[model samples]
Target: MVGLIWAQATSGVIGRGGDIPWRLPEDQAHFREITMGHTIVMGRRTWDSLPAKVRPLPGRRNVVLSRQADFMASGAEVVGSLEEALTSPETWVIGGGQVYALALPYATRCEVTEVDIGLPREAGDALAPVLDETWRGETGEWRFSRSGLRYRLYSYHRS
Candidate 1:
């Protein structure tokens, strides 16, 4: 299987910024539908961000990387290194900066959600997703709201 690494980020700011900012319900539904059957690789922080009710993200296998203790759930797995996670030809690397940075080189296919937003200088935690010349990119229509907020979602692949 091709170890396709996927990701999604929002331009919406939460009560605490540096979080998913998408305002569309369809976006969230799309995330769940597409990602459900794969192995989701993510940082510990990203895993922790899930509510207890949705801990392991059902219907898919989960692999979270962290220096902390190993996480073992019915569908969840944990590894300390990026290389260790490459045994599968296809894996989806979900967000939190550390996980994305580490998996950048090994990812063959990346699905990124491009949201249009600006941030204040203080929230340095929300880093921009890296787009290198190594991949071919495709984008969707720039979505707009009556309130004048605009955004679009983009997908990238290592072509």
Candidate 2:
């Protein structure tokens, strides 16, 4: 099973300046809970965006996709394509805009956290991929984060 997971603002912004623009601990916890022990795949930028202390994302298999033939990431496997990253029986494409878009067609599931924050589309360098009609989404109740951010989770299955 290939799953794509991410959190996006109302404007579909997922990243700005190589990092998530907002701080929502609950969303981060939710991400860790779901992805723990699973094989997580990400683009080189996503790997680079990770904090130095948690670069490999403990407890999960980290696979970094990079087009650079000489790229090397410590504590993680480096692959040149999404196809190579999908070698595991279960894989999660955990992203940056380019990798998410590239893996979208092969994703069977989507785990999304819809953040009730708005940012101009131009402000973000990475945007979430549009979920088409082929995907059936089940949304959870809205919740407020300790930091006062409103958010909700959605599970989407591709039909």
Candidate 3:
């Protein structure tokens, strides 16, 4: 099964993701624990959003999508087409909008960690992509936070 993961904030958008976006240490730690050791798919902007040391997220196989003639990274493989990336086994559709939108068609699962607050964009200065009805995924096994600033780790399974 293919797994897709989405992160959202109090406003239901993933905090303007980058290496330095504001997040509680606890939550950030949980995020790394959940995503480590997997294949993460992201756009060029998302990759660039990270500090060089964190860009290719260690322990995770990074798949970056871009049409740039010669874009490449030491720990990541570059792909010009979203189709090819999504076809790989156990691929996680990490996002920055473009990559998420492209993979939405074939993604079989999604893990969205919504935070209790929203922050300004740190990367390409873009907005979040809308999740539509046609996506018909169901939420099962959810986790909620007790902290005044609450959040949920919503898991979606494709129907």
Candidate 4:
């Protein structure tokens, strides 16, 4: 299955100032658990923003999407288009906005965490969908973490 996974707040804010604005460790761990050992696809900027210590996220085959003919990263396979990335046996569409937009239509499943708040629109670094007609599917029960933030895991299918 092609799965798209991400965490966003109420206003669909996935990024801010070229970084994730929130520090929800629980969400971080959750993300790892969901994508580990799977093929993870992300935009070039997303791969670039990764800390040097964890460049090619451990335990997953990393595919970075870029149109640049000369893009290179030490440990990732660069795919010229989303089509190349979707060829994986099982893929996790992780992102940095444009990739998400392109991958959403190909996703058979979407796993997302709806956090409790939103960042200002002007502060947005990128935008991706939260819930829409194409993703009005049901979800599992909501779960709260030790951080006191309320969040829920969602499962979506094409409408």
Q: Model-by-model lDDT, in order?
A: 0.61, 0.91, 0.67, 0.81
Of 1 and 2, the candidate ranking higher by lDDT: 2
For model 3, how does the per-residue alpha-carbon lDDT over 53-74 read when each residue is reduced to its tens digit? 7667888878888998699766
TM-score, candidate 1, is 0.76
TM-score of candidate 4 versus the correct structure, residues matched by position: 0.89
| Candidate 1 lDDT, 1-159, residue by residue in tens | 323333333432221354554455555565777677777787777777777688778877777787766465444778778677666545677666766677777766665554445644245454545658987888889876443555566667774
Clashes of each: 6, 0, 5, 0
Overlapping backbone residue pairs in candidate 4 total 0
Find the candidate with the highest TM-score and give its number. 2
Misplaced by over 4 Å in model 2 are none
Q: What TM-score, to 2 decimals, does candidate 2 have?
A: 0.96
Q: How would you order the candidates by TM-score, starting with the best?
A: 2, 4, 1, 3
Clashing pairs in 2: none
- Model 4 misplaced stretches (Cα beyond 4 Å): none
Clashing pairs in 3: 4-109, 4-110, 5-111, 8-13, 9-13
Measured over all alpha carbons after superposition, the RMSD of each candidate to the real structure, in angstroms, is 3.7, 1.1, 3.8, 1.9
